[PDB]
Write an enzyme that holds these catalytic residues in place. Structure first.
Site, PDB file in Angstrom:
ATOM      1  N   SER A 164       0.789  -1.278   0.065  1.00  0.00           N
ATOM      2  CA  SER A 164      -0.102  -0.010  -0.024  1.00  0.00           C
ATOM      3  C   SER A 164       0.979   1.077   0.069  1.00  0.00           C
ATOM      4  CB  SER A 164      -1.071   0.088   1.294  1.00  0.00           C
ATOM      5  OG  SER A 164      -0.044   0.329   2.427  1.00  0.00           O
ATOM      6  N   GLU A 210       0.428   3.740   1.854  1.00  0.00           N
ATOM      7  CA  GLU A 210       0.851   4.045   3.440  1.00  0.00           C
ATOM      8  C   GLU A 210       1.834   3.164   3.778  1.00  0.00           C
ATOM      9  OE1 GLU A 210      -2.599   3.046   5.905  1.00  0.00           O
ATOM     10  OE2 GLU A 210      -1.391   2.377   7.685  1.00  0.00           O
ATOM     11  N   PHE A 240      19.374  11.277  -0.711  1.00  0.00           N
ATOM     12  CA  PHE A 240      20.598  10.593  -0.225  1.00  0.00           C
ATOM     13  C   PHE A 240      21.538  11.694  -0.594  1.00  0.00           C
ATOM     14  CE2 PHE A 240      17.585   7.425  -1.519  1.00  0.00           C
ATOM     15  CZ  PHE A 240      17.612   6.760  -0.425  1.00  0.00           C
ATOM     16  N   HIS A 287       3.361   6.065 -13.525  1.00  0.00           N
ATOM     17  CA  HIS A 287       2.038   5.391 -13.975  1.00  0.00           C
ATOM     18  C   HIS A 287       1.796   4.536 -13.129  1.00  0.00           C
ATOM     19  CE1 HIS A 287       3.251   6.687 -18.440  1.00  0.00           C
ATOM     20  NE2 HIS A 287       2.184   7.383 -17.795  1.00  0.00           N
ATOM     21  N   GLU A 301       2.048   0.469 -12.822  1.00  0.00           N
ATOM     22  CA  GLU A 301       3.295   0.075 -13.276  1.00  0.00           C
ATOM     23  C   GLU A 301       4.102  -0.557 -11.963  1.00  0.00           C
ATOM     24  OE1 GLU A 301       4.707   2.429 -16.484  1.00  0.00           O
ATOM     25  OE2 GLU A 301       2.964   2.346 -17.341  1.00  0.00           O
ATOM     26  N   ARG A 330      16.398   1.402   0.310  1.00  0.00           N
ATOM     27  CA  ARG A 330      17.060   0.456   0.977  1.00  0.00           C
ATOM     28  C   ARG A 330      18.249  -0.142   0.573  1.00  0.00           C
ATOM     29  NH1 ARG A 330      16.902   0.411   6.281  1.00  0.00           N
ATOM     30  NH2 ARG A 330      14.658  -0.092   6.421  1.00  0.00           N
ATOM     31  N   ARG A 387      -3.626   3.954 -15.182  1.00  0.00           N
ATOM     32  CA  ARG A 387      -2.431   4.804 -15.576  1.00  0.00           C
ATOM     33  C   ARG A 387      -2.244   6.094 -15.241  1.00  0.00           C
ATOM     34  NH1 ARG A 387       1.421   4.366 -20.296  1.00  0.00           N
ATOM     35  NH2 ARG A 387       1.632   6.633 -21.095  1.00  0.00           N
ATOM     36  N   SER A 405     -15.044  17.396 -19.574  1.00  0.00           N
ATOM     37  CA  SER A 405     -15.423  15.921 -19.602  1.00  0.00           C
ATOM     38  C   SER A 405     -15.516  15.447 -18.345  1.00  0.00           C
ATOM     39  CB  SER A 405     -14.187  15.141 -20.349  1.00  0.00           C
ATOM     40  OG  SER A 405     -14.479  13.821 -20.452  1.00  0.00           O
ATOM     41  N   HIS A 460       9.655   2.778 -15.428  1.00  0.00           N
ATOM     42  CA  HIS A 460       8.142   2.402 -16.074  1.00  0.00           C
ATOM     43  C   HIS A 460       8.017   0.869 -16.133  1.00  0.00           C
ATOM     44  CE1 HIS A 460       6.851   6.573 -17.533  1.00  0.00           C
ATOM     45  NE2 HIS A 460       8.217   6.717 -17.285  1.00  0.00           N
ATOM     46  N   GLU A 491      11.905   0.687 -19.166  1.00  0.00           N
ATOM     47  CA  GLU A 491      10.743   0.020 -19.185  1.00  0.00           C
ATOM     48  C   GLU A 491      11.237  -1.339 -18.449  1.00  0.00           C
ATOM     49  OE1 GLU A 491       7.637   0.872 -20.100  1.00  0.00           O
ATOM     50  OE2 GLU A 491       8.039   2.731 -21.029  1.00  0.00           O
TER      51      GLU A 491
END
Ligand SMILES: [Zn+2]
Lengths: 165, 304
Positions: free
Chosen positions: B9, B11, B47, B65, B68, B80, B123, B132, B192, B266
């Protein structure tokens, strides 16, 4: 990657493998021949899988002809399957013979994220017939839950499962 | 005990970013750079070893996106990874000493929560635009780089809708404003999925970029380092010819704003699972990508 914006790509190989892709020219899912290697993401095993990826945001398209008929499309503005009149040819991918087909195809990958995780029985040794959504099968399937822990893909009845998922 | 081999999540991710900064107050700081359309904070991990003055830095961008997921999962493992290997790996340790790393694991928080709870493939952002009933704009077509040119739609219902105007999406504006204020970014890497490609400008035009030569070399070096973990294969090229025209994309905006080392990854896979990459592939993806990321970063360290 925006899958639907890629061209067909047979690749560089000599295999003969019929597949589907979303064609930007016609905005419909269409057959092409795949050469078994390299290619790209715009390649689907069935027509429905292709529409589930690329079709459901298109506007309704009557087309030129007037051999007219009542069809269904997923309206992106309301996210509801609605009726439209199809002229009979040159339509786009957003076109289904029945309300139910329109709903089931377009909702294929648009369910909550938790519906797509593996059914998790949990550590405990109970046996509670619970249902979960299995996206491979595209169905809410019974399984057996231990009783504690697990994940959100866990429902007491089938219609409960298909209501969420 | 954060399971980096599981999808989480928003969170949990925000919290783990906090723990990382807690455990390495010397090295990592969670900075809020803005908010989303629905008013969620946009958090980056900074960092650094430079006591609070502006150093040269590279921007690592992920989760623009929302569907993804491998993108966000890789980005937080990388958080990490960077702290855990500082002063244990000559590679990052040498990069960090020279420069700062800014890491945005979830560039589109509203969309991410929407994928978790409502629509797995979503996305776009979740901005609600006059004109709209359709929701959202594609944040990777929204930048001020040949905005609204070929490679983006003006139909609000499109997955690749560019939005009302350049930087209309507050998530995007937040990054733009912050990078420009800083003003000495050297690398910009956008994560992505999927397809296994590593690309560079341009997407808005067939024109070769002035640094196209070096970009391809680095890309290929980075591609090779990545392959050298588990054999995962990437293709390399400019965006427009490798995938399609894309106007208003982040790496193009960056490059036209004097950030030379602008790349898109990607990530996995090639289509077997697509966006729904199983959790058991998060770590393998993250390990291999790390090498490609370091290779690019090493290269940036040296051109300084
Ligand atoms: Zn993307």
């Amino acid at each position: 990657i925006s899958v639907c914006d890629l061209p067909a790509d047979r690749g560089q190989c000599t295999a003969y493998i019929p597949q589907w892709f979303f064609a930007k020219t016609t905005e419909d899912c269409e057959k092409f021949v795949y050469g078994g290697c390299q290619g790209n993401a715009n390649r689907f095993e069935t027509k429905d899988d292709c529409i589930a990826n690329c079709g459901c945001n298109l506007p309704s398209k009557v087309g030129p002809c007037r051999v007219s008929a009542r069809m269904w499309f997923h309206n992106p503005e309301t996210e509801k399957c609605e009726v439209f009149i199809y002229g009979g040819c040159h339509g786009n991918a957003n076109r289904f013979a029945t309300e139910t087909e329109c709903q089931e195809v377009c909702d294929r990958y648009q369910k909550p994220g938790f519906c797509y995780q593996p059914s998790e029985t949990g550590p405990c040794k109970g046996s509670f017939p619970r249902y979960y959504y299995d996206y491979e099968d595209g169905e809410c399937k019974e399984f057996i839950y231990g009783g504690c822990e697990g994940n959100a893909n866990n429902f007491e009845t089938k219609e409960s499962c298909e209501n969420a998922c | 005990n954060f399971n980096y081999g599981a999808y989480h999540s928003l969170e949990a991710i925000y919290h783990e970013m906090d723990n990382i900064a807690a455990d390495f107050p010397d090295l990592a700081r969670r900075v809020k750079i803005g908010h989303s359309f629905e008013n969620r904070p946009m958090y980056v991990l900074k960092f650094s070893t430079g006591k609070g003055v502006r150093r040269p830095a590279v921007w690592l961008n992920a989760g623009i996106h929302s569907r993804e997921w491998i993108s966000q999962a890789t980005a937080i493992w990388t958080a990490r990874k960077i702290v855990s290997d500082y002063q244990r790996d000559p590679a990052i340790t040498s990069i960090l000493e020279k420069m700062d790393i800014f890491l945005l694991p979830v560039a589109n928080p509203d969309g991410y929560v929407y994928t978790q709870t409502q629509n797995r493939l979503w996305r776009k952002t979740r901005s609600r635009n006059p004109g709209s009933s359709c929701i959202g704009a594609d944040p990777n077509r929204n930048w001020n780089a040949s905005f609204a040119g070929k490679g983006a739609s003006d139909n609000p219902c499109s997955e690749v809708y560019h939005g009302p105007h350049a930087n209309s999406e507050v998530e995007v504006k937040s990054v733009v404003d912050f990078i420009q204020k800083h003003g000495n970014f050297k690398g910009f890497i956008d994560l992505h999925s999927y397809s296994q490609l590593l690309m560079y400008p341009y997407g808005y035009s067939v024109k070769k970029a002035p640094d196209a030569e070096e970009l391809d070399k680095v890309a290929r070096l980075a591609a090779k380092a990545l392959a050298s973990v588990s054999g995962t294969e990437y293709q390399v090229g400019p965006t427009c010819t490798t995938v399609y025209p894309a106007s208003g994309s982040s790496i193009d905006w960056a490059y036209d704003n004097g950030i030379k080392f602008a790349f898109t990854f990607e990530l996995r896979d090639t289509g077997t699972y697509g966006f729904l990459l199983p959790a058991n592939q998060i770590i393998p993806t993250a390990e291999e990508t790390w090498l490609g990321l370091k290779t690019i970063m090493e290269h940036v360290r040296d051109n300084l």
